[PDB]
C-alpha cells in the first residue's frame, strides 16, 4: 500500500483538508 499524488489531491478535496492552506499561510512570508 503506497501513497499516490492524485489520490492524495482528491482526498484532500473530499475530506476537506486545509493542511496545505495552513502550510501556505505559514510559508508565503510576504515575499514580494
Amino acid at each position: 500500500p503506497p501513497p499516490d499524488e492524485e489520490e492524495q489531491l482528491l482526498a484532500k478535496f473530499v475530506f476537506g483538508d486545509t493542511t496545505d492552506l495552513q502550510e501556505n499561510l505559514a510559508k508565503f512570508n510576504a515575499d514580494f
Partner: protein, 147 residues
C-alpha cells in the same frame, strides 16, 4: 472594575463569533457591495465565486495577486473559519491579510478590488478583526464612497 465592564470586555473578545441566528444576520449583513437585506441572504459560495472572478481581473491588472489566489482566495478558504484555529494560525492569516491590504491599497479606484476584498470582509471579518490595517491602507480615499 464592574461586572458590566468585564462583560463588555468579553463581548469585545467574542465580537465575531455568531452564537445564534440574529447575531449571524447582524454580523453577515455587513457587506461592502450589497445592502443588508441582500447581504444577509447571500452564501459563501456566491460571494466567493464572484470574488474569485474579481481577483482574476485584479491579477491580470497586477500579477502579484496570484499567490493570494493560492492561499487567501483558494477553495479551502471557503470552509476555513477564522475563530476556530489557534493564535499562530491567526497571526499567519493576519499577516496574509496585511499583505493583501497593503498590496491592494493602490488599486482602490477600480471595482475588482472592491469585489475582491468583499470576501475578506465577509469570510475573514477584517472589518472588525484586521481593522487598523484596513483604515490605514485606505486612508487616502477619504473623499470617496469606498471609504
Amino acid at each position: 472594575s464592574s461586572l458590566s465592564d468585564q462583560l463588555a470586555q468579553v463581548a469585545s473578545n467574542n465580537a465575531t463569533v455568531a452564537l445564534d441566528r440574529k447575531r449571524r444576520q447582524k454580523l453577515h449583513s455587513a457587506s461592502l457591495i450589497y445592502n443588508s437585506k441582500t447581504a444577509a441572504t447571500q452564501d459563501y459560495d456566491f460571494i466567493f465565486e464572484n470574488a474569485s472572478k474579481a481577483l482574476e481581473e485584479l491579477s491580470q491588472i497586477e500579477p502579484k495577486f496570484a499567490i493570494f489566489s493560492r492561499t487567501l482566495f483558494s477553495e479551502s478558504s471557503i470552509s476555513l473559519d477564522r475563530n476556530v484555529q489557534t493564535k499562530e494560525e491567526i497571526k499567519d492569516l493576519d499577516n496574509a491579510i496585511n499583505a493583501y491590504l497593503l498590496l491592494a491599497s493602490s488599486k482602490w479606484y477600480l471595482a475588482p478590488t472592491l469585489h475582491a476584498t468583499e470576501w475578506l470582509v465577509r469570510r475573514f471579518q477584517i472589518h472588525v478583526k484586521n481593522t487598523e490595517m484596513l483604515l490605514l491602507s485606505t486612508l487616502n480615499y477619504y473623499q470617496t464612497p469606498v471609504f
